Amino acid sequence: SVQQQLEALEKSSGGRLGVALINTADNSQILYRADERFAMCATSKVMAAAAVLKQSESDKHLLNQRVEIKKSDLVNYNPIAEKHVNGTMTLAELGAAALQYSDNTAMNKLIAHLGGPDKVTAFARSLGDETFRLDRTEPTLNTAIPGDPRDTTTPLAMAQTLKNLTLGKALAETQRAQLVTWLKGNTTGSASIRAGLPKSWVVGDKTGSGDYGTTNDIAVIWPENHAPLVLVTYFTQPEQKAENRNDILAAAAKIVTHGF
Numbered sequence: 001s002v003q004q005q006l007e008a009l010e011k012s013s014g015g016r017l018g019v020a021l022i023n024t025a026d027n028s029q030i031l032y033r034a035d036e037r038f039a040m041c042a043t044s045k046v047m048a049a050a051a052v053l054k055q056s057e058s059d060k061h062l063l064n065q066r067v068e069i070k071k072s073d074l075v076n077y078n079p080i081a082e083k084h085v086n087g088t089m090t091l092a093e094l095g096a097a098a099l100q101y102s103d104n105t106a107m108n109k110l111i112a113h114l115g116g117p118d119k120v121t122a123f124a125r126s127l128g129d130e131t132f133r134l135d136r137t138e139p140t141l142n143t144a145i146p147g148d149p150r151d152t153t154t155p156l157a158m159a160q161t162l163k164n165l166t167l168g169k170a171l172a173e174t175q176r177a178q179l180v181t182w183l184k185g186n187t188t189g190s191a192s193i194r195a196g197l198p199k200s201w202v203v204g205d206k207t208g209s210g211d212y213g214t215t216n217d218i219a220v221i222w223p224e225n226h227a228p229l230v231l232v233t234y235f236t237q238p239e240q241k242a243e244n245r246n247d248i249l250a251a252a253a254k255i256v257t258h259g260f
């Protein structure tokens with residue numbers, strides 16, 4: 001059975017696995033530790049980008065607003081922002097970089113624009129997400145210490161919210177579409193959820209990773225002949241320097257989407 005397969009995967013893996021699959025054909029779910037908290041790491045970037053998209057619904061100039069990039073802004077992982085030092089990036093470009101490259105500078109610019117991690121949390125609450133919490137900026141939001149509630153959510157909460165954001169009620173249509181375009185264009189997820197799915201399926205995703213071998217991915221999946229699936233796979237380990245384990249996420253994806 002799918003629960004037995006997940007249990008065994010977890011057992012073998014040396015960690016703690018959290019899975020929430022929502023099948024939008026019938027709102028059925030596959031849940032494994034889905035009400036337990038995990039450090040989100042960069043999966044939290046979706047909430048900050050979406051909060052900016054929500055603002056853009058009532059401000060037509062916002063996404064083209066230029067933001068200065070200073071060498072001072074750079075932190076530990078800045079693939080896109082480092083190319084624009086001494087220049088500017090628009091808020092749309094910052095959303096794109098945060099989601100498609102997991103740029104940490106870009107996420108900090110989003111957070112600062114919004115008025116701090118608390119504001120990201122309030123945006124999640126406005127969507128009916130009672131679980132999400134953003135407490136820190138980049139890079140410290142990825143410390144992923146076992147039992148630390150900062151910068152955490154549950155698999156089910158994040159699957160529900162990702163569904164609302166990408167397929168449902170959270171954003172007006174142009175902004176929903178923009179979020180989906182960004183997720184589909186992610187460059188960091190090939191060995192995660194995507195690797196456990198049929199090649200022909202269309203996928204948008206956002207990865208996350210941190211200490212304690214914390215290895216995460218959240219995805220919206222469009223099968224060729226079926227309604228979409230929303231899948232959250234979170235994974236963490238007991239030792240601070242554990243290797244990250246994207247293969248576990250791919251394996252979980254295969255287990256829960258194999259029965260199609």
Ligand SMILES: CO/N=C(\C(=O)N[C@@H]1C(=O)N2C(C(=O)O)=C(COC(C)=O)CS[C@H]12)c1csc(N)n1
Pocket residue numbers: 041042043076077101102104139140141142143188206207208209210211212
């Ligand atoms: C103190 O901050 N520590 C981080 C960290 O910055 N995590 C963030 C996060 O999630 N990111 C993702 C991410 O989305 O997974 C990638 C991934 O980018 C790519 C190209 O794969 C790059 S690191 C950034 C970290 C990461 S691993 C570890 N021990 N710590």
